[PDB]
Design an enzyme around this catalytic site. Structure first.
Site, short mmCIF file in Angstrom:
data_model
loop_
_atom_site.label_atom_id
_atom_site.label_comp_id
_atom_site.label_asym_id
_atom_site.label_seq_id
_atom_site.Cartn_x
_atom_site.Cartn_y
_atom_site.Cartn_z
N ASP A 35 26.52 9.93 -60.08
CA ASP A 35 28.18 10.04 -60.28
C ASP A 35 28.27 9.10 -61.70
O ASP A 35 28.51 7.75 -61.45
CB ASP A 35 28.88 9.49 -59.30
CG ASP A 35 30.37 9.65 -59.53
OD1 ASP A 35 30.74 10.02 -60.33
OD2 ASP A 35 31.15 8.90 -58.57
N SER A 199 38.24 15.85 -76.11
CA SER A 199 38.07 17.29 -76.55
C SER A 199 38.85 17.43 -77.63
O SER A 199 40.03 17.37 -77.63
CB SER A 199 38.01 17.99 -75.40
OG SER A 199 37.74 19.52 -75.55
#
Ligand code: EMR
Length: 330
Positions: A35, A199
């Site tokens: 994770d 992004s």
């Protein structure tokens, strides 16, 4: 040194990925969920409440000649999905594909929430986010990656998740054969303790690319792609019959639909997520309504670049002095 382990989807939908980890002496192999959105290495164990164990492999610290109880240490974690786990702490030898860490904190569970109990294939988690999020009290512990970094050939780990297929987690090196073109690196903020990047935008199918800053985390421990409502609405608007359902808790679409791809920007580079990656099958057994892989992060507070996005790319988690994230097509 380096390490290389195969990661596999737990089911036919890639709901999660498991990677074998050897803990203790002699080796006790557990399949953990690596994770990058958390920082505790925790496992189902001989101490977990009997009713909260349903098929998982357990870690028995008493049978490990190198396990040492970390005096007075406890851990307790609550995840964005509502699941939780807690217990005591051991230090033990932990290895991942031939890369070994001695004295790694192994958080042994005494209690796990029902979400963990129902997933028989996930024996615990291996946190790869920044050690500042580690829940061990009163003395915080470091992640497996943090513990190995000095010994590693290069201070990096790579995530290469497969779509309906096995993949790889590499430590200490970049496999130049595992991707096409070049790796584009992007800046990372560690202020929230996550691999948080920005992004440069998105596109739906063959549509025109939209330049827009989307701050989010690269999170292997989250299955779906969680993005702003404006973005998710523009995607589902291209799928005939798609709608947001309050009963199901997200966007659903007709199972007979062929989904458009989703592109996300990494600097001037583009990662294309094929449409099939966004289909999470029937909402309930036998239903012709399917669950969408692109959901709204409006209720979360953070955008999450989970497995749906990461599995379309070869991802480098660069733990250099100033950490960065690398993305390449594959
Ligand atoms: N137990 C519900 C959550 N899990 C999470 C991982 O994928 C399978 C389902």
């Amino acid at each position: 040194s380096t390490g290389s382990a195969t990661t596999t989807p737990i089911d036919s939908l890639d709901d999660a990925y498991i990677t074998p980890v050897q803990i203790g002496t002699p080796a006790q192999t557990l399949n953990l969920d690596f994770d990058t959105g958390s920082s505790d290495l925790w496992v189902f164990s001989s101490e977990t409440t009997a009713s909260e164990v349903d098929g998982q492999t357990i870690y028995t610290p008493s049978k490990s000649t190198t396990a040492k109880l970390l005096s007075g240490a406890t851990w307790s974690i609550s995840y964005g999905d509502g699941s939780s786990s807690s217990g005591d702490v051991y230090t033990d030898t932990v290895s991942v594909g031939g890369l070994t860490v001695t004295g790694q904190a192994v958080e042994s569970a005494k209690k796990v929430s029902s979400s963990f109990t129902e997933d028989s294939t996930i024996d615990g988690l291996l946190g790869l986010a920044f050690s500042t999020l580690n829940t061990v009290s009163p003395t915080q512990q470091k992640t497996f990656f943090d513990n190995a970094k000095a010994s590693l050939d290069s201070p990096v780990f790579t995530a290469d998740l497969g779509y309906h297929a096995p993949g790889t987690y590499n430590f200490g090196f970049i496999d130049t054969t595992a991707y096409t073109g070049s790796i584009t690196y992007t800046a990372v903020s560690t202020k929230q303790g996550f691999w948080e990047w920005t992004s440069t935008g998105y596109a739906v199918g063959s549509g025109t690319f939209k330049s827009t800053s989307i701050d989010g985390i690269a999170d292997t421990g989250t299955t779906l792609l969680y993005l702003p409502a404006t973005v998710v609405s523009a995607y589902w608007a291209q799928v005939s019959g798609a709608k947001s359902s309050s009963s199901v808790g997200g966007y659903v679409f007709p199972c007979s639909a062929t989904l458009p791809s989703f592109t996300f920007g990494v600097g001037s580079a583009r990662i294309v997520i094929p449409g099939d990656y966004i289909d999470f099958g029937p909402i309930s057994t036998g239903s012709s309504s399917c669950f969408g892989g692109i959901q709204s992060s409006a209720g979360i507070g953070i955008n999450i670049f989970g497995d749906v996005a990461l599995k379309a790319a070869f991802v480098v988690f660069n733990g250099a002095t100033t950490p960065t994230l690398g993305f390449a097509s594959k």
